[PDB]
Amino acid sequence: NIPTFVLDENCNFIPDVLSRANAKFIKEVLIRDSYNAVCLANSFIPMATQTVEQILIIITKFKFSRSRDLLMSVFRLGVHINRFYAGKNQVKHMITMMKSLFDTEEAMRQLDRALMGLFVDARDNSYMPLIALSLHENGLPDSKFIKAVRLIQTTVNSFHNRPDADIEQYAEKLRAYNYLYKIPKYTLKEAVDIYSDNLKDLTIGVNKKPTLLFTSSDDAYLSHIYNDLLFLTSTWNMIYNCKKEIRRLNTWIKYEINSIMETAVLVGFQLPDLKETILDLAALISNMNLVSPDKELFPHYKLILAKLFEICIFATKANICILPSFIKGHLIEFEDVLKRSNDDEDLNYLLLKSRDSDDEYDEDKPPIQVDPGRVDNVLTDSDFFNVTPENAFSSIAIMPISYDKTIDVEDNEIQVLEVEMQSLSAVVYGAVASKYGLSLEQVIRKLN
Amino acid sequence: NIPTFVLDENCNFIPDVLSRANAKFIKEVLIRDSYNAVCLANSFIPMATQTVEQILIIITKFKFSRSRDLLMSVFRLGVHINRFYAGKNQVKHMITMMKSLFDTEEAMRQLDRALMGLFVDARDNSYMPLIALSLHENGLPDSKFIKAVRLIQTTVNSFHNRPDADIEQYAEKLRAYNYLYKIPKYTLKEAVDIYSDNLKDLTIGVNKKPTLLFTSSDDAYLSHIYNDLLFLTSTWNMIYNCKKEIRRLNTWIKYEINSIMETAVLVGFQLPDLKETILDLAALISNMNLVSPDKELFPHYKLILAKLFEICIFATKANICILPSFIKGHLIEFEDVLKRSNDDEDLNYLLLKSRDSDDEYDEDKPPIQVDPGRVDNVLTDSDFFNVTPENAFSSIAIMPISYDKTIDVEDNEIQVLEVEMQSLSAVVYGAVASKYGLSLEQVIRKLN
């Protein structure tokens, strides 16, 4: 389904948005079909946010399937940010090009004359505010676009409308370079050919004013203006919806960025070497949230995405299984076991194999991993945890981690219990203790 | 790459876990490569949780990509629940089979005799705690298993060890029906063939006592015991880890189920006809959470999985774009706009275009969708929302919805601001109002 003209060596990431190195990382980790889908979803073609999501399928090669959960979130975010940035620059140029059609009195009077010609039998003068005065970036939201097109369509009894056979199928090419564009009911293939070039030009950002039929000749006057107005209104509606979709991307991005902070902290539980990277990430997101409501956030997006790719690359090279949901589930279990634990039971007993465990063979004495009275710390498993000796005894990056537990329903309101987890660091300390054969007290004693 | 024996028409879901209609739904919405991967990930082959995840890729046919976000979470959960159930039943049988090898006094004396023979030159009696007394379901965790195999390996100085040709690559087939099994350094291909059969039977659940080479032959005795002890210890280590992984799945499932409640609520924003289904889901999850620890939760898992599939099937039939992350992002933006608004700006003003908005054409008066002073309510878009007239004036299923906003860092500690969102219901009544040509006031007055 992928058009060859959206193929790109950098997966269509703008240099200002993502580094060459990071763009290469994406090609390294995805299977061919997924890479091609990302190319299309990240391409110059205007599309609604839901269309981006349908196309965007992120599938890693088998090698990197261990860190899919992380890579998917980050890559998705990157596509959103890229479309946001690219989109803004694109619609700006579209506005400049479409505005230039009638930015002189002579061009406006030409349009005035054409409108007068087509609307010669009009019931009233509604074509002025609905069409004539709405050919700008705020002029034609969906609701007003529908009315404008219906009004144009009433003028078919003022000229001999003889649509080309199969013009509907013929005009389908007008979405080749633009999936946001709503194709109106054109009548002339001659007109559609011109609008095809116009729309392609608008997407590419070609420095060439749009062509209209009624300003290229004098022939078949009214049918030419009829099709031209359909083009003008649909294209301005498309431009309006570009601005709307850019707003929708911006809104999503801010939430994706705030929510991924917990993801990064959870990754840092599996790979504590990332501590400084994660804290740097937190500072970047803090600075982003500090900004006044009116301002442009892209510079923050750029830095944040870069920092997120640092985390992905490291996590991928570590070759452990990055499963933030699995880790959080086990942090919850740890707190629950701790909460129900007895008083001849400290964290050392709960988190760590006893030193002479391998001397125990009694079946009624479950070893620690299957003992419901102790903790199966998945971070003692080499597939879920690694740290260098240099960072083994540093504090971890931490933020408040909680989850809401559904406990009742009152009519339409679901009741929950917030479970705040405040002893999380212990499982990481327990992982270090296990790796290096120490007690918890010994590990903690690394106050430094 | 998928083994032939794991291909299945119900995606290897146990009937008691998932209905045949729901298994068919899975087959309907996934592409073939994804369906086959799910078949393997959901198969009787013992695997570590991380191995399951590496294999489990959920890819929808393009027709269903609109709801991929929901389907991915529910199907993943389903596989986890299935593996938990199947796994518990399977390891119980494995234990019964392996236990039956030495459950009579005559069988025990034969083993003791075998043991003394092989360990004739042992330098202590550690073969008793490490091996003889650890042939049970709690006997051989990884740390002990390593020591046990190392001890067995020392006995090659007590017999003529001439390992078969090409045995270590030949033994590779012992993981065909078991990916959790650790393959030890066997020496005899006659041994490996017996163990291949044993392991295949164990995974399938064949009511047939395993075979040992030293109790089935006479020839070259000591090398037979040597291989048999490697089989016994590795198989019991595998059984122990089965128990461990079952516990890991159970831990993960509880968190997936609690977290998906919010996902379901968000889907209900887009599809309020699901309100009663969502409130029933909350009651099921509440019941599950009520259960004292640690009882068997599968009856609850079963019901909850079936209720989630109801949500999936309805959302998919609806053919709208189900993006909980996107929706939550826009709930957050609505809150912010609401907070920034003044007393001249009521919800009706913030959420709905004015009556005569399509008469307005001034460029310097941005229409509602691109006006930063008002809300672009994505639920007025037919791609994101639908409801039947019968449910248009029912209140939505609601739960507390919050997000942590990262605002500062000090040392290793990340500081956040909890943002709890009130008035979320208004975006739905705003969608209803827009859908049916009503004011917000006209909607809210009709609510109970």
Residue numbers in the entry:
A (entry chain B), B (entry chain A): 8 to 455
What does the paper say about this structure?
HHV-6B U14 is a tegument protein that is 604 amino acid residues in length. U14 belongs to the herpes pp85 superfamily that is shared among beta herpesviruses, and has no homologs in alpha and gamma herpesvirus. The N-terminal domain of U14 (U14-NTD) adopts an elongated, helix-rich fold without any significant overall similarity to known structures.
There were two almost identical U14-NTD molecules in the asymmetric unit. Almost all of the U14-NTD residues were assigned to the electron density, with the exception of N-terminal residues 1–7 and C-terminal residues 456–458, indicating that the designed U14-NTD represents an actual structural domain of U14. U14-NTD has an elongated helix-rich structure composed of sixteen α helices, four 310 helices and two β strands. To facilitate structure description, the U14-NTD structure was divided into four subdomains (SDs) based on secondary structure topology and spatial arrangement. In the crystal structure, a dimer is formed along the long axis of U14-NTD in an antiparallel orientation. The calculated buried surface area per monomer is 4146 Å2 (red), which is a relatively large value compared with those of known homodimer structures of similar size, at approximately 2800 Å2. One noticeable characteristic of the U14-NTD dimer is an internal cavity within the dimer interface. Broadly spanning electrostatic interactions contribute to the dimerization. The HHV-6B U14 structure suggests multiple structural features as potential function sites, such as the negatively- and positively-charged clusters, the β hairpin flanked by the hydrophobic patch, and the grooves formed along the dimer interface.
